[PDB]
Design a protein around this ligand. Sequence first.
Ligand SMILES: *[C@H](C)[C@H]1/C(=C/c2[nH]c(/C=C3N=C(/C=C4\NC(=O)C(CC)=C4C)C(C)=C\3CCC(=O)O)c(CCC(=O)O)c2C)NC(=O)[C@@H]1C
Ligand SMILES: *[C@H](C)[C@H]1/C(=C/c2[nH]c(/C=C3N=C(/C=C4\NC(=O)C(CC)=C4C)C(C)=C\3CCC(=O)O)c(CCC(=O)O)c2C)NC(=O)[C@@H]1C
Ligand SMILES: *[C@H](C)[C@H]1/C(=C/c2[nH]c(/C=C3N=C(/C=C4\NC(=O)C(CC)=C4C)C(C)=C\3CCC(=O)O)c(CCC(=O)O)c2C)NC(=O)[C@@H]1C
Ligand SMILES: *[C@H](C)[C@H]1/C(=C/c2[nH]c(/C=C3N=C(/C=C4\NC(=O)C(CC)=C4C)C(C)=C\3CCC(=O)O)c(CCC(=O)O)c2C)NC(=O)[C@@H]1C
Ligand SMILES: *[C@H](C)[C@H]1/C(=C/c2[nH]c(/C=C3N=C(/C=C4\NC(=O)C(CC)=C4C)C(C)=C\3CCC(=O)O)c(CCC(=O)O)c2C)NC(=O)[C@@H]1C
Lengths: 161, 161, 161, 66, 160, 160, 160, 160, 49
Amino acid sequence: MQDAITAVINNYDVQGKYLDGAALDKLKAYFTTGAVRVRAAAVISSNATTIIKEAAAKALIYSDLTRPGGNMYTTRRYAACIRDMDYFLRYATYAMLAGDPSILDERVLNGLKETYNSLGVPIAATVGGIQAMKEVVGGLVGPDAAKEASIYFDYLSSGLS
Amino acid sequence: MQDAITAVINNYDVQGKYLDGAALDKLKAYFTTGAVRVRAAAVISSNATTIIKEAAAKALIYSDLTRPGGNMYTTRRYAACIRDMDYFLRYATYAMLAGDPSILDERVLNGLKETYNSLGVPIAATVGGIQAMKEVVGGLVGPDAAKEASIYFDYLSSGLS
Amino acid sequence: MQDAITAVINNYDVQGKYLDGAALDKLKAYFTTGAVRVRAAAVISSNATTIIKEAAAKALIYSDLTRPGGNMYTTRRYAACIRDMDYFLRYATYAMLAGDPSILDERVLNGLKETYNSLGVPIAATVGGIQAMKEVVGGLVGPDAAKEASIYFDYLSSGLS
Amino acid sequence: SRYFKVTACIPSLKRVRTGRELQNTFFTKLVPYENWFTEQQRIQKAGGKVLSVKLFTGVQGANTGV
Amino acid sequence: SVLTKAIVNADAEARYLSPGELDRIKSFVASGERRLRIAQTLTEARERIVKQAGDQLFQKRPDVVSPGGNAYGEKMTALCLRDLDYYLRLVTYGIVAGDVTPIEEIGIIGVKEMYNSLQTPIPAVAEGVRAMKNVATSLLSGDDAAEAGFYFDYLVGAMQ
Amino acid sequence: SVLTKAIVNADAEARYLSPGELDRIKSFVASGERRLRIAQTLTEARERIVKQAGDQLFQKRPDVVSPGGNAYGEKMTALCLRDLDYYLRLVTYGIVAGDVTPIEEIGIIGVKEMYNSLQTPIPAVAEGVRAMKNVATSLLSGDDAAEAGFYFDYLVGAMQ
Amino acid sequence: SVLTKAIVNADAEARYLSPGELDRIKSFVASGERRLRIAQTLTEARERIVKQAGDQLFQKRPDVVSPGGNAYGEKMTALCLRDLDYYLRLVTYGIVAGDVTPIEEIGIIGVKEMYNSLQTPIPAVAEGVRAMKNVATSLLSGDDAAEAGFYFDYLVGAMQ
Amino acid sequence: SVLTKAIVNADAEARYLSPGELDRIKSFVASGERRLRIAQTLTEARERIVKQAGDQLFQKRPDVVSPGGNAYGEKMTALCLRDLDYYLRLVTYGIVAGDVTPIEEIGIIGVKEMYNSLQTPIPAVAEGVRAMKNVATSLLSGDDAAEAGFYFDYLVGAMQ
Amino acid sequence: IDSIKIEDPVKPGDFANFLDMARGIESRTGVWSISYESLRTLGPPEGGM
Ligand SMILES: *[C@H](C)[C@H]1/C(=C/c2[nH]c(/C=C3N=C(/C=C4\NC(=O)C(CC)=C4C)C(C)=C\3CCC(=O)O)c(CCC(=O)O)c2C)NC(=O)[C@@H]1C
Ligand SMILES: *[C@H](C)[C@H]1/C(=C/c2[nH]c(/C=C3N=C(/C=C4\NC(=O)C(CC)=C4C)C(C)=C\3CCC(=O)O)c(CCC(=O)O)c2C)NC(=O)[C@@H]1C
Ligand SMILES: *[C@H](C)[C@H]1/C(=C/c2[nH]c(/C=C3N=C(/C=C4\NC(=O)C(CC)=C4C)C(C)=C\3CCC(=O)O)c(CCC(=O)O)c2C)NC(=O)[C@@H]1C
Ligand SMILES: *[C@H](C)[C@H]1/C(=C/c2[nH]c(/C=C3N=C(/C=C4\NC(=O)C(CC)=C4C)C(C)=C\3CCC(=O)O)c(CCC(=O)O)c2C)NC(=O)[C@@H]1C
Ligand SMILES: *[C@H](C)[C@H]1/C(=C/c2[nH]c(/C=C3N=C(/C=C4\NC(=O)C(CC)=C4C)C(C)=C\3CCC(=O)O)c(CCC(=O)O)c2C)NC(=O)[C@@H]1C
């Protein structure tokens, strides 16, 4: 994976350039944001189970998916769906700390569409569940944090779709 | 492992003897007991969690073991102890169906003392827990079943001590 | 393994005692020395190869050990011996940071003696090599750290002997 | 090649396992010499204790045939 | 502890401690004096914290202290308080260690399995810890409270 | 970086970031402004540092700058200086990252094998880095120099 | 089914089906007609079984049908009954199959995790299944009831 | 030896020795008498070979015998000669064995690590072995020298 | 030489909070009136002895 600080370093290393003021400014920008991000991450981790429950209630459950024949029908499939939700939440939190979307591409997004298509998992519903989580997260984290949090959730959703 | 039927066969095979009426009578004895054993086994499996809880309440918990400085202190150790209790119960049930104590020697009893000594697990307390389970099991299974069940519990306890 | 801080915690946990003033004093004693240890560790790591060379020169090589009939004769055995020297140095550094010798017991001293006895590795020479490393290190780390570093080397040597 | 006979006892301190793990916990075994140093380390990191070590095969202090 | 964790990662890589890892050790030893003070405050107020948190939990959830509930009856209620006290003690250990390693070994591994045998409801236990955090936060200074909050939050997350 | 390392360890454990790991990130973001200043100082003085370090190295080891030695001849001497410059650039990157992870991929993995093919002596290279540290330390403030020292030491350790 | 299980064991052994394994298949096919009758009886009485079992469960545990409880409210109470109906359907499938494989794949794998998200208490669910068994037993003939009992017991064992 | 190697390969295959493997043993035992003569010649001329090779090596690498260099000083120079003598003895053992297995255990495994601690340059050592080969070749008959050359070459290959 | 603190309003006023120390009214149905030290030695819940 790559983070904001490393991303700057890598760009300068391919040029072979020593770090310069312009580069320093980008690094400085991350450092101000950082404290806020750490607080947001702790909030998410503590409320993680609740976030997933609320998001499922909003989108997945009480639906045709849960009703027989639906892909979230059967305990095995229900459990798998909430497991995937948890993964998305955990990785989005990692991305928010890192300040980079790259980790999502490397670890979550790679191969996901193809896997889902073979499984028969409905992508649109999954995207809906991610969007639901984002809304719930937004409330918990608070507004300043929410903007930062939202971009990573949006990045996941766009990748899946 | 060995069961009652195979135990007779093995004894005759070392002699080289064809199966005889006296041998047949021992086999016949097992076959009458068998139906009762199957019923007992189903009772134990359904009530397994309860049996362990009751037995722990009788011997292990509310004791110095659970209190700080005791072997069953800390969640990790508490969980390990009730896991061992479950093992003993499951293997005794297997032995009762089999009608032979061999499986207990082969799987449960072999190496247990040495492992326990290195771990620092107290054997006497463990034995006490097994004896407690036996009493609880006796009630559930009913008297005819209980006699058969008791011998395997006793066999475990003697092995451990 | 345990360090200074966890050593106190574990001692109180078995009693089930909340940390008290006596405990707090011990923890404070560690915290005040910490910065010094970190500096010492960096010195040792950077000079690790040199420390082993100097220690071997002072205590092992140019001797009967390196000559035919000696345990550190052959490239294979010379290499094995300086490999062991490297671990002792690395583990002593870990112990010095931790402020606890437990790691030395758990991950160095345990089963070393038995292995050495079967091999016939000469203990006195090894201890001599550990003692030699100690002398070398004391110079590099300086007054702040020398006393602290020394005790872990002494602990290793006394464990073998 | 030289071989070691090794007895060790290893506890599971990170997790609680339902399947029978007795064979993993107390394991006397024969180890090639070239593997032992790694296998000792592994037991130590797990917080197992190495109860015994004996050299089953091979001669102590042999320059060749090792 | 912080120290233990750093050493363990290095040992796995079979390397000496990284410059970054060394820096983290330095920072922790500087923080240590403040941490000790935070822990002392909580230790002094412990009896009050446990009692108040128990109050709140029972108010939030009547059920646990009801004939159906596990906590019902004096003895049971005492045991539930004893549990809260255990978790508070663990949190104090955590603050001085600077990591949850102490907490985790004693309290978070096998906790689900233990409570399931007892039949105690895990979400209620989590609520009790949340309650304890609120009491603790009030006694602590704002900066101190934030530090303490993390450790409390970890517990709540683990017991879920 | 500090961030990368923390995330990677958590991902392996498949857990959210620990309270202690979060605290380390907080400390690092506070430190960052100072770190940027330290890096800038070294960047400005780089040409001087390299030159001075080169001289010291050649004085310390006649052999490298001798007909037998690898450094001998103008082209070779330039290359040896170029290498010193590369290592200094890496050190600056490391200081801002707070960890050697970036440094390690670019400079420390495969370094032995590369130098062995070239036939350059590794211990001499290490001496050059030590030399660079001494020059750099003098320019830096005492507190700054200690921070910078660790990164320099890591390099010396890796080339050993 | 019995068939599926037998084939799977043979595949693992990489052998043709043993005489003993073939005998087990023979016994199952003989029993099949009786099994179908038992299943039909339960299917007809399903609405009654669910309703009566629900009532017994609510009597056994007032809490679930209380403001704190998960079952509280009409919609929630319906859902709890719906779940009981699902488990009854699974049991009928199990009886005809002669094994719990059908039951297990649809209902017992991941059940803990599903219920934990919902926050439904697992022991109460088990009680509801026990209740269903008692109702079912009364409708069934004694011999039939014993057969049915095993499958009911398995469910209770799997989630408790 | 050739014998050891053949048996070891057979034991791994868990078979009696193959016709081809047996043939190789036959050829080796025929060669053996000649091999013993070659070894004797080298043993007799050993003192001369070492001395001449040393001189050439110091001619080839002035640096090693210079104040910076490891070989510098009488004791150090003696040790460098002692090492050359050791390698010559190993070569003789190898010639009679017909295989480098004996040589490899005593001299080639761990050689890099040993020399790196000493700080002796490995390429210089290889040059000394090459030097020894040239002297040895002159004393040996052309056919004998070729056989001896292989063993000398192996050494050079093993440390390079 | 100041104790400082006391920054939030020292008293909301008669109407808010007060009588904070209710603790010790009847038997410890709640948590108050159970000894903090008693916990160290709870004993069996049956407590048959
Ligand atoms: C209170 C918040 C909730 C509650 C608690 C409760 N616990 C018990 C019984 C026990 N609790 C423990 C727990 C621990 N032992 C440990 O090692 C640790 C980690 C340090 C803990 C947390 C133990 C071992 C017991 C068993 C008894 C004993 O300790 O000897 C009860 C009693 C119920 C019973 O015995 O069945 C209760 C009530 N119950 C609730 O409902 C509250 C939400
Ligand atoms: C409970 C009555 C008592 C208790 C038990 C206890 N056991 C352990 C650890 C282990 N228990 C075993 C035992 C078995 N594993 C098997 O495979 C079998 C046979 C099927 C048995 C019976 C083993 C191997 C371990 C080690 C690893 C593991 O978890 O399996 C502990 C934990 C000790 C530790 O520190 O690791 C405990 C507490 N101890 C008591 O105090 C009770 C009286
Ligand atoms: C050097 C100071 C002395 C010396 C060393 C020596 N050691 C071996 C062989 C082994 N060393 C170990 C030891 C360890 N196992 C561990 O877990 C640790 C802690 C990290 C250590 C240090 C082991 C396992 C072996 C055997 C396997 C291996 O070679 O890796 C030898 C070789 C002996 C032989 O006959 O092959 C030697 C020479 N002996 C001396 O002469 C010095 C005094
Ligand atoms: C009744 C005995 C208990 C009870 C049940 C309860 N369940 C829900 C919600 C759901 N239940 C399920 C269960 C299943 N899906 C499956 O695939 C299977 C196996 C075939 C089962 C049994 C599901 C999927 C849901 C989610 C909602 C949906 O169906 O779309 C609730 C309500 C949800 C909530 O948490 O409010 C309840 C009440 N609750 C109890 O406590 C009773 C003891
Ligand atoms: C000569 C070609 C080069 C050279 C040699 C040199 N060697 C040493 C020291 C030692 N050399 C050995 C080597 C061996 N011991 C063995 O068991 C084997 C395998 C059979 C060998 C080849 C050893 C063990 C030593 C250690 C000291 C001792 O003799 O016990 C030195 C001195 C080392 C020092 O640091 O002072 C030297 C100089 N050095 C060169 O530059 C030549 C190219």
